[PDB]
A paper describes a structure:
The large trimethoxyphenyl substituent occupied the central pocket area sandwiched between the hydrophobic residues V222, L263, L343 and A353. Two of the three methoxy groups additionally formed a water-mediated hydrogen bond to the catalytic lysine (K235). In the crystal structure of the ALK2-K02288 complex this group bound to the exposed solvent channel where substitutions are likely to be well tolerated. Here we report a novel 2-aminopyridine inhibitor K02288 with potent and selective activity against type I BMP receptor kinases.
Ligand binding induces type II receptor phosphorylation of associated type I receptors, leading to Smad recruitment and phosphorylation by the type I receptor. Most importantly, there is an urgent need for selective ALK2 inhibitors to treat the debilitating bone disorder fibrodysplasia ossificans progressiva (FOP).
Residue numbers in the entry: 203 to 498
The structure:
């Protein structure tokens, strides 16, 4: 199997989930995620999705192999993907500003990726409908051509129309608190309905729009990279922190004055605002966001 053939070179990321490494396979960089024991369900889910569904798409992180292996005399669960050397959107936004073309490229490729996940495709070629549930700038990678791809199907949920069956998996993992929709933070989300999970994705994608737009230059100026809600919650905010700010105080990220004098940024501000209605039913769909971005 593929695990045995990889040389781990350096660690590019670490958290409670485990670790991601640059390794070489067949003379190429690959990304290897090594799961912690506390997160083996996310390995199982990603492996399930990539193996049982046809998931090749320019804007979805490309799967190579999933593997079990031994190291230091214990079992490690590995997920091997294409390696993107520009790193995550999160890192990238910190190291560079964007022009209009670069910004729209980033946001259109996210929306294309997400539309693709959300939409059930029929036949011998296709795929069930899929919601992500942990969309954020750290789970989006930047490719050399300026497009992005969506990463981490660990929390993914599926629906298929023949049977109308919802598969929510079996993962105790929760999404990133910073990016939880209101109906998640207030725990009134209807867990038996596929559409609810789509709407949590849209809420999160709104925030990512906001994060990107800040780094687009207009009138020679930019805002510094910041995470959503930077001004009102601490680092590593609690569930209650976010509940107070999003649900109780009803806060939403501020739109800089200067966006309103640029058309690309004005379109983006309206889009992201309609990802952020408290009432989930009111939010734009991925396909609507994609189509609009294709107009600009
Ligand atoms: C975010 O979730 C993941 C990301 C990557 C990944 C990361 C980098 C990278 C490199 C340098 C800096 C930096 O921030 C990221 C490049 N290519 C990649 N594919 C791989 C993953 O599974 C193997 C993964 O879990 C799904």
């Amino acid at each position: 199997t593929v695990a045995r053939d990889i040389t781990l070179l350096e660690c590019v990321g670490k958290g409670r989930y485990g670790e991601v490494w640059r390794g070489s396979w067949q003379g190429e960089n690959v990304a290897v995620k090594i799961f912690s024991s506390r997160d083996e369900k996310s390995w199982f889910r990603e492996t399930e999705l990539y193996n049982t569904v046809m998931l090749r798409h320019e804007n979805i992180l490309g799967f190579i192999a999933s593997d079990m292996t031994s190291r230091h005399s214990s079992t490690q669960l590995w997920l091997i993907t294409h390696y993107h050397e520009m790193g995550s959107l999160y890192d990238y936004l910190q190291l560079t500003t964007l022009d209009t073309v670069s910004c729209l490229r980033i946001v259109l490729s996210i929306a294309s990726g997400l539309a693709h996940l959300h939409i059930e495709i029929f036949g011998t070629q296709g795929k069930p409908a899929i919601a992500h549930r942990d969309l954020k700038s750290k789970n989006i990678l930047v490719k050399k051509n300026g497009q992005c791809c969506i990463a981490d199907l660990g929390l993914a949920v599926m629906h298929s129309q023949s049977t109308n069956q919802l598969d929510v998996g079996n993962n105790p993992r929760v999404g990133t608190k910073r990016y939880m929709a209101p109906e998640v933070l207030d725990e009134t989300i209807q867990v038996d309905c596929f559409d609810s999970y789509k709407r949590v994705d849209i809420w999160a994608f709104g925030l990512v729009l906001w994060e990107v737009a800040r780094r687009m230059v207009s009138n020679g100026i930019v805002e510094d990279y910041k995470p959503p809600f930077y001004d009102v919650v601490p680092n590593d905010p609690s569930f209650e922190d976010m509940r107070k700010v999003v649900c109780v105080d009803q806060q939403r990220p501020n739109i800089p004055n200067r966006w309103f004098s640029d058309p690309t940024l004005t379109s983006l501000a309206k889009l992201m605002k309609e990802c952020w209605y408290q009432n989930p039913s009111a939010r734009l769909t991925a396909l609507r966001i994609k189509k609009t971005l294709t107009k600009i």
